[PDB]
């Protein structure tokens, strides 16, 4: 009868061997034309291996896969031309190769991630799978870059992605975090996943005024409701946290009369004069405005504004001396004829309610019955004789004088001076 060299053969195959790979040849001995056949084998044996009925060579006819089957049991029956038969078994062991990529499973991503999250806030939960065995299935993760995110390993194949750095939406509003996982096989395989992080806003920025303080000039006699300035503050926060409202909180004026002077539009920051300013009553006043955001809690800043009321020429000069008659004339009839040049006949005394050039007075002769007999001090308003009185000079003299300010246009007052020389 036929007989195999032994009952049980053992071979190992790498899962990556191509179809048609030589597994083993088994032969029985007539000591002839013997037939070989599988018997009592699994269905997958018939589907993976080919047994030469005449030669007894065994080859694969399809691809292997350690993840699907780690071993095969092959029973071969040898039949000579007679009825007798013999059997042997071949236990085929499959070897694991690194042919399965690691995969990364990310859940519970903190979306969005508040910018005030404490150190150690759990952003995401990470889990790794690897269908291979042993080292080929041993996966480890790490984060690329140094943007402030660290992987904490709670147990094997489980990670927590945590912050280790204070966040700031105003500096970095979005993050792309790449987590890479690699196995420890030969050669190693790796995969990666990109976690996108949206940093949500917190009201952590107070409004800031565009200027450290405000110096405003407003011409006197302005209409009420005249826009005199516009404050502006900025706030990098989002939405309600960056919405600014302006207001007036303090002033060196009477608190009950503050609204009667100035206001500010709460949305535009335009500052209005609520009344016609009068430089002669008040030259300047101080003001403290506030910019406030609409966050919880609110943030604010304070800025000082000074308003300078500008002088206009709204007052004409007025003569205080000499006293004038209803016709605007004054009489000086005791002027001695022997008066030496420089004799002070009289002095026009005028005042002006304004300031600066608007109240800088100058005195002019408009009409003279004898030009050059009398002089008129341009700035003093002193009326003096300029030359010795002559024999052909009239006893009665008349001057029409004007006191003007230095405004534009110049306002003035006039007076007629009857100067009458007395005979000795
Ligand atoms: C985080 O990453 C995403 C996605 O980026 C994509 O994948 C990466 C691995 C890289 O290969 C990138 O090059 C790739 O875009 C960024 O999203 C943004 O996606 C759009 C989609 O096309 C990118 O292109 C724009 O698409 C519009 C669509 O109409 C075009 O009109 C634009 O002209 C533009 O091309 C966009 O570039 C991309 N932004 C990037 C790469 O910065 C996401 O922005 C990124 N986050 C950060 C903070 O960088
Ligand atoms: C800006 O100033 C505001 C004014 O509030 C009042 O005035 C001052 C003089 C203090 O006495 C203050 O306590 C009063 O309530 C404040 O309300 C506000 O907090 C200030 N903001 C900043 C950023 O300083
Ligand atoms: C192909 O090669 C293998 C090498 O071991 C043999 O075992 C087989 O029988 C066939 O000759
Ligand atoms: C997975 O990603 C790593 C990145 O380090 C590569 O080196 C590797 O070859 C595979 O592409
Ligand atoms: C209101 O309007 C005046 C001009 O009329 C500006 O000067 C002011 O700043 C505010 O915008
Ligand atoms: C005044 O200017 C600030 C910027 O400094 C703006 O935020 C504001 O809207 C106004 O234009
Ligand atoms: C004084 O001067 C002004 C102009 O300077 C006149 O308008 C006024 O009537 C007076 O003569
Ligand atoms: C001075 O003179 C002018 C010109 O006559 C008058 O208008 C004024 O009232 C004052 O008498
Ligand atoms: C001063 O007074 C005389 C009249 O006495 C006027 O003629 C002159 O214009 C000014 O008013
Ligand atoms: Ca496989
Ligand atoms: Ca494998
Ligand atoms: Ca693997
Ligand atoms: Ca911030
Ligand atoms: Ca913010
Ligand atoms: Ca804010
Ligand atoms: Ca005035
Ligand atoms: Ca004035
Ligand atoms: Ca004046």
CA distances from 33 to 58, 74, 80 (A): 18, 22, 6
> How far is 341 from 334, CA to CA, in rounded Å?
16
Atom of ligand 7 nearest to the CA of 403: 1
Count the neighbouring beta carbons within 10 Å of the beta carbon of residue 349.
13
> How far is 380 from 361, CA to CA, in rounded Å?
9
Count the neighbouring beta carbons within 10 Å of the beta carbon of residue 228.
17
Task: Please indicate, yes or no, whether residues 15 and 78 belong to a single structural domain of this protein.
Answer: yes
Q: Are 415 and 330 in contact (CB under 8 A)?
A: yes
The binding site comprises: 15, 65, 67, 96-100, 115, 130, 132, 136, 168, 170, 183, 201-205, 220, 235, 237, 241, 278, 280, 293, 311-315, 352, 354, 358, 405
Q: What string of H, E and C letters represents the secondary structure of 274-326? A: CCCCCCCCCCEEEEEEEEEECCCCCCEEEEEEEEEEECCCCCCCEEEECCCCC
* Token output for 320: 């205080």
Q: Are 194 and 183 in contact (CB under 8 A)?
A: no
Facing residues of 85 across strands?
A: 79
* Token output for 25: 């040849």
Task: Please indicate, yes or no, whether residues 258 and 296 belong to a single structural domain of this protein.
Answer: yes
| Phi–psi pair at 325, nearest 5 degrees | -75, 170
Q: Could you tell me the distance, in angstroms and rounded to a whole number, from the CA of residue 179 to the centre of ligand 8?
A: 97
Decide which of 290, 310, 330 is a domain's last residue: 310
Provide the CATH number for the domain around residue 333.
2.60.40.60
> How far is 92 from 73, CA to CA, in rounded Å?
6
Read out DSSP for 36-97?
A: EEE-S--HHHHHHEEE-TTT-EEEE-S---TTT-SEEEEEEEEE-SSS-EEEEEEEEEEEP-
In Å, the largest CA–CA distance within the chain is 189
* Token output for 141: 């993760």
Ligand nearest the Cα atom of residue 418: 9
> Of the candidates 185, 135, 123, which has an alpha carbon nearest to the alpha carbon of residue 159?
123
Q: Is the peptide bond before 276 cis (omega within 30 degrees of 0)?
A: no
Q: Are 131 and 137 in contact (CB under 8 A)?
A: yes
Cβ < 6 Å from ligand 4: which residues?
Answer: 180, 182, 190
- Sequence-distant (6+) residues with CB within 8 A of 112 are 197, 198, 199, 200
Task: Please indicate, yes or no, whether residues 244 and 186 belong to a single structural domain of this protein.
Answer: no
b (16+ CB within 10 A) / e for 295-310: beeebbbebebebebe
Q: Are 244 and 207 in contact (CB under 8 A)?
A: yes
Task: Please indicate, yes or no, whether residues 295 and 237 belong to a single structural domain of this protein.
Answer: yes
Q: Are 233 and 268 in contact (CB under 8 A)?
A: no
Q: What kind and span of H or E run contains 105?
A: strand 103-107
Which 8-state DSSP code applies to residue 201? P
Helix (H, G, I), strand (E, B) or coil at 14: strand
Write out the E strands in 316-411: 318-321, 329-336, 344-347, 349-351, 362-368, 374-376, 382-385, 396-404
Decide which of 310, 333, 359 is a domain's last residue: 310
Q: What angle do CA 8, 50, 34 make, to 5 degrees?
A: 65
- Sequence-distant (6+) residues with CB within 8 A of 189 are 98, 100, 101, 102, 182, 183
- Residue 266 Ramachandran class (φ > 0 left, ψ -120 to 50 alpha, else beta): alpha
- Residue 12 Ramachandran class (φ > 0 left, ψ -120 to 50 alpha, else beta): beta
Task: Please indicate, yes or no, whether residues 110 and 158 belong to a single structural domain of this protein.
Answer: yes
Task: Please indicate, yes or no, whether residues 213 and 162 belong to a single structural domain of this protein.
Answer: no
Atom of ligand 6 nearest to the CA of 210: 5
* Token output for 61: 């006819």
> How far is 404 from 412, CA to CA, in rounded Å?
4
* Token output for 405: 């300010």
Listed in sequence order, the DSSP H helices in 192-301 are none
- Residue 252 Ramachandran class (φ > 0 left, ψ -120 to 50 alpha, else beta): alpha
For tokens 């049980």, the residue is 8
Count: domains in the chain = 4
CA distances from 272 to 141, 246, 247 (A): 64, 13, 12
Task: Please indicate, yes or no, whether residues 220 and 290 belong to a single structural domain of this protein.
Answer: yes
Is residue 192 in contact with ligand 1, taking CB distance under 6 Å?
Answer: no
Give the mutation target among 252, 298, 302, 303 for probing the ligand 2 site: most ligand atoms within 8 A of CB.
Answer: 302
Q: Are 36 and 69 in contact (CB under 8 A)?
A: no
CA distances from 112 to 153, 262, 297 (A): 23, 44, 21
Range of the domain at 132: 103-200
The binding site for Ca(2+) comprises: 15, 65, 67, 96-100, 115, 130, 132, 136, 168, 170, 183, 201-205, 220, 235, 237, 241, 278, 280, 293, 311-315, 352, 354, 358, 405
Task: Please indicate, yes or no, whether residues 416 and 327 belong to a single structural domain of this protein.
Answer: yes
* Token output for 308: 């300078």
Question: Strand pairing of 85-95 and 8-14?
Answer: parallel
Closest residue by CA, ligand 3 atom 10: 22
Q: Are 283 and 307 in contact (CB under 8 A)?
A: no
Q: This structure's resolution (angstroms)? A: 2.3
Give the mutation target among 319, 324, 328 for probing the ligand 9 site: most ligand atoms within 8 A of CB.
Answer: 328
Read out DSSP for 130-152?
A: -SS-GGGG-EEEEE-S-SSEEEE
> How far is 288 from 251, CA to CA, in rounded Å?
6
Task: Please indicate, yes or no, whether residues 221 and 306 belong to a single structural domain of this protein.
Answer: yes
Give the CA dihedral 310, 315, 317, 319, nearest 10 degrees. -140
- Sequence-distant (6+) residues with CB within 8 A of 141 are 104, 126, 128, 151, 159, 179, 180, 181
Q: Are 293 and 203 in contact (CB under 8 A)?
A: yes
> How far is 385 from 336, CA to CA, in rounded Å?
11
> How far is 383 from 374, CA to CA, in rounded Å?
7
> How far is 276 from 423, CA to CA, in rounded Å?
58
Count the neighbouring beta carbons within 10 Å of the beta carbon of residue 291.
24
Task: Please indicate, yes or no, whether residues 329 and 386 belong to a single structural domain of this protein.
Answer: yes
Task: Please indicate, yes or no, whether residues 58 and 153 belong to a single structural domain of this protein.
Answer: no
> How far is 258 from 278, CA to CA, in rounded Å?
15
> Of the candidates 237, 281, 278, which has an alpha carbon nearest to the alpha carbon of residue 115?
237
**Count of all residues that appear for the chain in the document:** 424
Decide which of 264, 282, 310 is a domain's last residue: 310
Question: Strand pairing of 284-293 and 244-251?
Answer: antiparallel
Q: Is the peptide bond before 281 cis (omega within 30 degrees of 0)?
A: no
Is residue 406 in contact with ligand 7, taking CB distance under 6 Å?
Answer: no
Task: Please indicate, yes or no, whether residues 306 and 324 belong to a single structural domain of this protein.
Answer: no
CA distances from 386 to 155, 290, 375 (A): 116, 66, 6
């Amino acid at each position: 009868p036929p007989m195999f060299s032994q009952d049980v053969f053992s071979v190992t195959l790498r899962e990556d061997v191509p179809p048609g790979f030589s597994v083993l040849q088994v032969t029985a001995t007539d000591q002839a034309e013997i037939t070989y056949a599988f018997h009592n084998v699994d269905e997958q044996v018939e589907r993976i291996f080919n047994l030469d009925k005449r030669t007894g060579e065994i080859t694969t006819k399809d691809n292997l896969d350690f993840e699907t089957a780690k071993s095969y049991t092959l029973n071969v029956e040898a039949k000579d031309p007679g009825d007798l038969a013999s059997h042997c078994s071949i236990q085929v062991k499959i070897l694991d190769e690194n042919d399965c990529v690691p995969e990364v499973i990310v859940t519970s991503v903190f979306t969005p991630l508040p910018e005030d999250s404490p150190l150690g806030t759990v952003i995401a939960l990470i889990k790794t799978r690897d269908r291979d065995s042993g080292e080929n299935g041993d996966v480890y993760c790490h984060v690329l870059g140094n943007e402030g995110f660290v992987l904490k390993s709670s147990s094997k194949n489980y990670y927590k992605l945590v912050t280790d750095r204070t966040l700031d939406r105003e500096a970095i509003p979005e993050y792309n975090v790449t987590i890479v996982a690699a196995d420890r096989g030969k050669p190693p395989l790796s995969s990666n996943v990109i976690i996108t992080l949206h940093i949500s806003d917190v009201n952590d920025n107070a409004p800031v005024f565009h200027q450290a303080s405000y110096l405003v000039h407003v011409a006197e006699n302005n209409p009420p409701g005249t826009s005199i300035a516009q404050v502006s503050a900025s706030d990098p926060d989002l939405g309600s946290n960056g919405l600014i409202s302006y207001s007036i909180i303090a002033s060196d004026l009477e608190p009950r009369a503050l609204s009667s002077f100035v206001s500010v539009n709460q949305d535009s920051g335009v500052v209005f004069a609520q009344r016609a300013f009068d430089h002669e009553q008040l030259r300047s006043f101080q003001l403290t405005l506030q910019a406030r955001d609409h966050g919880s809690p609110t943030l604010s800043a304070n800025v000082s504004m000074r308003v300078l009321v500008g002088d206009r020429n709204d007052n004409a000069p007025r003569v205080l001396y000499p006293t004038l008659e209803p016709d605007g004339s004054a009489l000086f009839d005791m002027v001695p004829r022997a008066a030496e040049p420089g004799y002070l006949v009289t002095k026009v005394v005028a005042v002006d309610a304004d300031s600066g050039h608007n109240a800088w007075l100058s005195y002019h002769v408009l009409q003279a019955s004898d030009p050059g007999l009398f002089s008129l001090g341009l700035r003093t308003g002193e009326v003096r004789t300029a030359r010795a009185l002559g024999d052909r000079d009239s006893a009665r003299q008349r001057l029409l004088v004007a006191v003007r300010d230095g405004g534009q246009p110049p306002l003035s007052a006039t007076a007629t001076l009857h100067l009458i020389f007395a005979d000795s």
